[PDB]
């Protein structure tokens, strides 16, 4: 047998391919499970670990988003930006992005710590990456976020139905 969530994911994929956006969104809302399509989960983890956050942010924009994983990921990307001394970009991301606004609202202290870190004239990596390494943070973020995402072949439902027709045609159905 197969889990309902998987079948609903197949349906949602079909809806996406058939350009039925409204029914797709309404479905995802009602059943509270969302399709999160990626070419490869390993490739996704690779993208997160390597440090290519433009792509990762693209994928993030594509999928259904939890606020917590968002504020975590965006926080880490903020620290990565302030490390590379892209102060303007980091401040703009911290100010003008939705998960960062949510973080600012819910926890003023955390946002204050991030802004304080950005305001510093130099990047003090010893303590922040001393407590937990960059590689480890990237690793846990990649793991938790990737476990949320799924991988499914294009027109999976149709192919499956084709297999069903092949079954009926060449093997046959049960007599009663």
């Amino acid at each position: 047998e197969i889990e309902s969530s998987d079948v609903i994911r197949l349906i949602e994929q079909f809806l996406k391919e058939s350009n039925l956006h409204r029914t797709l969104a309404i479905l995802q809302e009602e059943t509270n499970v969302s399709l999160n399509t990626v070419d490869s989960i390993d490739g996704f983890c690779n993208e997160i670990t390597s440090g290519n956050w433009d792509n990762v942010l693209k994928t993030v924009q594509s999928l259904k988003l939890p606020a917590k994983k968002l504020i975590d990921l965006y926080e880490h990307v903020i620290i990565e930006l302030v490390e590379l001394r892209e102060l303007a970009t980091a401040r703009l991301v911290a100010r003008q992005t939705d998960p960062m606004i949510l973080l600012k609202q819910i926890d003023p202290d955390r946002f204050a710590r991030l802004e304080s870190l950005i305001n510093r004239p130099y990047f003090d990596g010893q303590e922040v990456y001393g407590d937990v390494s960059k590689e480890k943070r990237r690793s846990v973020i990649a793991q938790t976020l990737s476990s949320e995402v799924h991988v499914v072949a294009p027109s999976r439902l149709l192919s499956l139905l084709g297999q069903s027709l092949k079954w009926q045609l060449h093997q046959g159905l049960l007599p009663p």
Partner: peptide, 18 residues
Amino acid sequence: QSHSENRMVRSLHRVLFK
């Protein structure tokens, strides 16, 4: 309206601000 330093920076800026 897009400050371009690193390629990943200008691209992430492109994505987040559009």
